[PDB]
């Protein structure tokens, strides 16, 4: 079971970002609920930003013109078409730019989960290159939770890890 | 032993970006409405004035065939058909007709 | 045709729901309506790229 570098997990259902483990006591998936909630807060504000900007106060009810008011009719048509072209442009561009930034945002955040793990494990685990780390020391459920919580006690497992490393 | 990853799903919804097209994503929001019911509805409880076969000129000048409209004093909007026939039954020029239609659009 | 329905936005082709910011149904509307855009789709990403391992 490889991580983010090869593809996603269909076995992880409680958040967008998270962890998977295999240990003596068992295995499974669990979400990183703080990285996921912060990502959600960001995305929710982004969705609302799109909604708030596109505020329509425009009246499109048309007007009739006479046979001798063609210049006015054509000016009115030009105005309606010009505003439509501009708003169509703005709506499409805003959505494409935001979709692209959103995908980069999420890719950045999964990378950050990976980096905050190697910054704790350091030489106590082998970085594999498939989005996972192999602890040199034997690790139980309590140290797995400690790494996920950002509280890993590196010194505590340093001697065992060195011997195996 | 410890792996870092992200959620995968069975969604087939796709989005576009500038560099790539038809990217499948796990969650998305459709921001565009593309359908309608095909009917004229009340707006906040009030019915439109339907002119039937009457033009606006017919309705306002009165027209022997627009008698069903003389009793309706209030409305939410006015609905005219594509080609009304019961307009100015006695032929003539209606002065500032278009301008009257604009005035009656706020009534 | 007229019916007994109630809507917040009415277009000449029929009433619409008006819950999303944009529509592509018709440029002329009456009521509390979405912006008219000449686009086929405006779908926004909220989630992740969906590539299972």
């Amino acid at each position, epitope marked *: 079971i490889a991580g983010f570098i090869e593809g996603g997990w269909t076995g992880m259902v409680d958040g967008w970002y998270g962890y998977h483990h295999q240990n003596e006591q068992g295995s499974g998936y669990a979400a990183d609920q703080k990285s996921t909630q912060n990502a959600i807060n960001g995305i929710t504000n982004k969705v*609302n930003s799109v*909604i708030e900007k596109m505020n329509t106060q425009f009246t499109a009810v048309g007007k009739e013109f006479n046979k001798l008011e063609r210049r006015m009719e054509n000016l009115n048509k030009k105005v309606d078409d010009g505003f439509l072209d501009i708003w169509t442009y703005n709506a499409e561009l805003l959505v494409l730019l935001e979709n692209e930034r959103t995908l980069d945002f999420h890719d950045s955040n999964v990378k950050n989960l990976y980096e905050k793990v190697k910054s704790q494990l350091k030489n106590n685990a082998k970085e594999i290159g498939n989005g996972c780390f192999e602890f040199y020391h034997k690790c139980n459920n309590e140290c797995m939770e400690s790494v996920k919580n950002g509280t890993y006690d590196y010194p505590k497992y340093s001697e065992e890890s060195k011997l195996n490393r | 032993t410890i792996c870092i990853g992200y959620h995968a799903n069975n969604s087939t919804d796709t989005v576009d970006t500038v560099l790539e097209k038809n990217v499948t994503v796990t969650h998305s929001v459709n921001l565009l409405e593309d359908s309608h019911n095909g009917k004229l509805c009340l707006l906040k409880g009030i019915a439109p004035l339907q002119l039937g076969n009457c033009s606006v000129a017919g309705w306002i000048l009165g027209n022997p065939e627009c008698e069903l409209l003389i009793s309706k004093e209030s409305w939410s909007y006015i609905v005219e058909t594509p080609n009304p026939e019961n307009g100015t039954c006695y032929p003539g020029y209606f002065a500032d007709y278009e301008e009257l239609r604009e005035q009656l659009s706020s009534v | 045709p007229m019916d007994e329905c109630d809507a*917040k936005c009415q277009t000449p082709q029929g009433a619409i729901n008006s819950s999303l910011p944009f529509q592509n149904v018709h440029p002329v509307t009456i009521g*509390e309506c979405p912006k008219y855009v000449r686009s086929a789709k405006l779908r926004m990403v909220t989630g992740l790229r969906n590539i299972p391992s």
Partner: antibody
Amino acid sequence: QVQLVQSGAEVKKPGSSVKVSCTASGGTFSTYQFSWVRQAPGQGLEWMGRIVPIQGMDYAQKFRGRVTITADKWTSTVYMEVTSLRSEDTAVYYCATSRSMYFYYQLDVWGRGTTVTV
Amino acid sequence: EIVLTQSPGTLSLSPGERATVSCRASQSVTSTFLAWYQQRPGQAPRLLIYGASSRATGIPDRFSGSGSEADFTLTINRLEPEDFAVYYCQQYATSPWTFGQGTKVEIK
């Protein structure tokens, strides 16, 4: 922080429908997920259904076909209509919003609730 | 469906004493989808714990909880006069969302 405001109490005769509502304030209505929860006198809480105005809706199966839950972003108000009322429908109906169950999380903002008597 | 059974129906203790409330699900449920609520008579439910264990904003250190699979517990240390209320077990993992009966705490 959202401040939900609810409508007053209702008294109905059997067979009629009741519409109750919650007004959201202090945030953007469209992305809040609004749940309706009922509590019969002397009983625990029961979930009836949920609306995400910009995304979709769901219902408790017991009320599917009797309860319609809708929303209006223009007045920032969520409505629930319960049809074919029966004498067991004497519960207090509350709104609550989730923290983030646009996608994944629990209910942490609650309104005061409205009593419906049948 | 996911069915939540709470126990005891009524818990009774001296103020300052520790209370626990048990909840058992009909099926195993991921802990991310559990929550606990406190309903003081005359009031709408307040969120205490979200997920099996995270404490909600504005809720004091007296409250904590944990569990796994189908078995979860709410812990209230040093229970105070304002905590003699009814606690509810709720899960949002699948539709329909489900609630337990509720556990009342009495003053003795």
